[PDB]
Amino acid sequence: SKLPPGWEKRMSRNSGRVYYFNHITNASQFERPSG
């Protein structure tokens, strides 16, 4: 785990894929969130 303040690193079982979720902008991406 190595994300900035505000982001939450989550994991999606079954398929085994990494996905991030921002509780500030409720945005979802598939890459290292920079800011």
Beta strands 17-22 and 7-12, pairing class: antiparallel
Q: What is the CATH number of the domain that holds 29?
A: 2.20.70.10
Q: What is the per-residue DSSP string for 1-35?
A: ----TTEEEEEETTTTEEEEEETTT--EESS----
Enclosing domain of residue 32: 1-35
Domain count, the chain: 1
Experimental method: NMR
Tell me the β-bridge partners of 17: 12
Tokens, residue 18: 């990494």
